[PDB]
Symmetry: D2
Subunit: 233 residues, 4 copies
Amino acid sequence: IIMISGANSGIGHACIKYFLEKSFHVIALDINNNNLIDYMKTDMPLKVVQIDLSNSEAIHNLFTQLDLEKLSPDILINAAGIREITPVLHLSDDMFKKVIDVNLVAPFILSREVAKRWCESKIKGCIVNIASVSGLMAEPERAAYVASKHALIGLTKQMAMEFGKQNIRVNSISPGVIRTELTALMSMIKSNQSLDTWGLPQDIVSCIEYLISDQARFITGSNFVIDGGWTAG
Amino acid sequence: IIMISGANSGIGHACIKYFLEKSFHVIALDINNNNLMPLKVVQIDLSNSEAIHNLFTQLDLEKLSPDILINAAGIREITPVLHLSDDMFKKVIDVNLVAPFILSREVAKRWCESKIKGCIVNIASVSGLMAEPERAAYVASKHALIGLTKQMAMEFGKQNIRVNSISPGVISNQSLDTWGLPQDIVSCIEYLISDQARFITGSNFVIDGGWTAG
Amino acid sequence: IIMISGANSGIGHACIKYFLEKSFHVIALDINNNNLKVVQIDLSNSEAIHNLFTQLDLEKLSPDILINAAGIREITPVLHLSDDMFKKVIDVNLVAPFILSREVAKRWCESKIKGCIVNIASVSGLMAEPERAAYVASKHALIGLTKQMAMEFGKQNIRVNSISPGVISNQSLDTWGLPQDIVSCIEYLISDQARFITGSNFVIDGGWTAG
Amino acid sequence: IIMISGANSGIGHACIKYFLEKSFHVIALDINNNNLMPLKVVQIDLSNSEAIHNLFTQLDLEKLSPDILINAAGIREITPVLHLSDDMFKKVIDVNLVAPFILSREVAKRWCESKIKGCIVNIASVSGLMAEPERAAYVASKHALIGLTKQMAMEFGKQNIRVNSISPGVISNQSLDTWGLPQDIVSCIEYLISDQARFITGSNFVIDGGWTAG
Ligand SMILES: NC(=O)c1ccc[n+]([C@@H]2O[C@H](COP(=O)([O-])OP(=O)(O)OC[C@H]3O[C@@H](n4cnc5c(N)ncnc54)[C@H](O)[C@@H]3O)[C@@H](O)[C@H]2O)c1
Ligand SMILES: NC(=O)c1ccc[n+]([C@@H]2O[C@H](COP(=O)([O-])OP(=O)(O)OC[C@H]3O[C@@H](n4cnc5c(N)ncnc54)[C@H](O)[C@@H]3O)[C@@H](O)[C@H]2O)c1
Ligand SMILES: NC(=O)c1ccc[n+]([C@@H]2O[C@H](COP(=O)([O-])OP(=O)(O)OC[C@H]3O[C@@H](n4cnc5c(N)ncnc54)[C@H](O)[C@@H]3O)[C@@H](O)[C@H]2O)c1
Ligand SMILES: NC(=O)c1ccc[n+]([C@@H]2O[C@H](COP(=O)([O-])OP(=O)(O)OC[C@H]3O[C@@H](n4cnc5c(N)ncnc54)[C@H](O)[C@@H]3O)[C@@H](O)[C@H]2O)c1
């Protein structure tokens, strides 16, 4: 059982399809589901929850439903995220906070909750946080985004230490520019990379597969940068 | 004119005495004032953003705007993560990240409108570079702050607004055989705000007795 | 074809085993050989490297993939660490990766062919330790070098990445790392699934660098 | 007494004026001397480690042990990496990394022997934190030097020997509209050797006008 946030789009949605193909049971979290409706009509082992991850009450109601339905996820993938592009002086309090509530607070809460159940059961859990190269190098017009992505890397490290004794591994992936719904400008992207190729969702999906695998037994608290050389210098 | 949050204790408090004694006009922000000349002391809960907005309404009525922001208000939970509630996680984030962001946006706005230089110094921590147990919020919030620092340094650089951070160690795991003291952090602030710091922006100054070395 | 330095021991030897088993033409380089082209070479000798490349230019053998795993760790108080012991660690741990990396990249650029280099660094490339001045300098240098060479050769599809093993209490996890944790990472990093990965350093360390 | 490599040019040079003018006895170390009061000038190739060992034998016989060491001698190749030869890479390493290693071990030996409380500053670079085109040896050497700073800080910390580095940017890819000047490096050196730097070691001070910010 693998629980994936941001399931309606981009990376999270490429994960939904990939992991259903390899016979995982998938719990999909997203605030929209227009791009999951078709799959909901099938008999695939797919539980879709509609949920505003910025509402921490709704996150409890999620865990109430999972407990009552007897779903303990084995893996959590925190991919849901938002990103502002607005001058910092135009960025309102609420919207700074929204970006924080989705990108940082929600991963923390979902992580505390799955980890509570894993601790209680002696299960060997796995968590992957999708941060960003904005968690390492800043960008203009992105105060909250950079802040939130730096915070999530930090959080990954902290929570790896908190739960390592229980063999719950917690890692992050920091994508560079990946072509999804979230994303002249193209030549600027390339001029800031080393590779002349576009980042795709499959590059992140593959990294997740590596990091949830048995081969990743000794991997915790690390940040895997998947960015075509953006952070190189 | 320097604005200092966390003025009622430790690093912020030590900054009060020191810049008053250097002849600065001081605006002191803290939720407590028991521990508190050109000194405006404000009793304020900095996790309440409505109260930061009202502070600025008062400051604009007073035609009083800071040249310098020191974000030293801060809280550290010590709680096992399973016992760290939603609200406490968020409170730590609202004090340690959201309040520096709001205070910084606000003083940046007025520096940009007045076309005046400005300087912000953010008090982070070594917990911004290295995690520790029982510190989910503290660590995430301090990391976030370091990232906030670099971001706003980039945002405002062209307008000559410098934004830097300091990451103190503790004020065995150290390299030096001495205690970190408040004055070690004050001296670095003094440096970061000075004319000698004209070319320093987006930098994190670690003052930690070798704690982060290895 | 894959070239692996440090082939006689630990991480390098584990790779020889795995990549034969996977059908690769392996080229092992090492000073010792007591444990497939096997070359006995001291990599701290720059003219031996140039000769290996001479020989290899005559045999048609230029690797598709390079794995710099040859390394030595002094454990020496820094006051007793001689000039020559310091240069040697630097010559093996840094200079040789660079010479070996420049040489394969030369042939890849000429042939207009993709290449892949994985540099075995260390968590000592990120966090210092006492009594390891050369080692820590050298592994910090190699992380630097990986990023620089990732930039240098990106637009020729030459990918350059590194791995920072922990030890193969100061960790988060209660197990010991194994040469296979590092081999599995090298495998991932040379895969077609790593098309987008360059300049990155992969930490594989049980949480050692976490905090 | 302050020992300064690279004393003939740029940052080492500007340190010569500066610390002479503040009453330090200075030992200038460089391979050239055309741009060079209690001053001892040594013409020395810092890539030749026999000569270094010589200098210190001599200095011991003159009972001159420096109190402070500034490692500023440096070289940057700008050369495409396919044209960077073995010798060229080794030379950059020998100057930028090996020499500061040796000079540092040599002055620490004497501080430990005499029970002095010494101070070392390493002049690294933003290329110690970020790669650039055509700078394989420079980038590797400068990353090496940050790493050595942390390690020797850890080694000699029980002996109150502080080891720190500074990472100059350029002395558009910056956030500030401005050039670094040697003085920005010199003031930072002055701060790191001071009594207010008592709790500072292992640290890396970036002075780059936002280059590394993102
Ligand atoms: N695409 C990129 O270039 C890129 C690069 C680096 C990092 N990232 C990060 O990767 C992750 C996914 O990015 P993507 O490109 O797939 O984005 P995307 O916008 O295509 O999809 C993100 C999904 O998150 C969901 N989400 C947002 N807010 C939510 C809420 N409050 N409750 C529930 N769901 C919510 C969205 O609705 C969406 O379906 C994010 O964490 C993002 O910051 C993306
Ligand atoms: N002392 C250390 O070991 C250490 C180390 C690294 C970083 N720090 C950081 O340095 C800064 C100052 O720490 P300190 O040791 O001086 O702490 P302290 O507890 O002595 O002082 C912090 C002050 O912040 C104030 N504060 C907390 N919440 C507030 C709110 N909601 N509104 C207004 N004020 C509030 C407190 O009332 C207190 O006066 C903080 O950012 C802290 O995280 C401290
Ligand atoms: N095992 C660990 O805990 C660990 C941790 C971090 C990094 N590393 C690094 O991984 C790499 C391999 O590690 P290992 O555990 O396999 O060490 P090892 O001693 O088991 O293997 C090193 C190999 O490198 C070869 N080598 C050393 N000097 C040489 C020279 N001058 N010329 C040619 N070959 C030479 C040795 O002969 C040996 O076969 C090294 O770069 C090392 O620094 C290891
Ligand atoms: N200027 C910048 O923008 C900048 C940026 C980042 C880092 N740095 C670093 O700052 C330090 C000083 O830089 P600078 O700009 O003053 O450089 P520079 O070239 O102006 O001066 C360096 C000096 O080191 C000396 N030197 C070189 N090789 C020597 C040898 N083998 N023996 C003795 N002396 C030798 C040279 O003769 C020269 O006088 C260096 O370590 C450099 O890498 C400078």
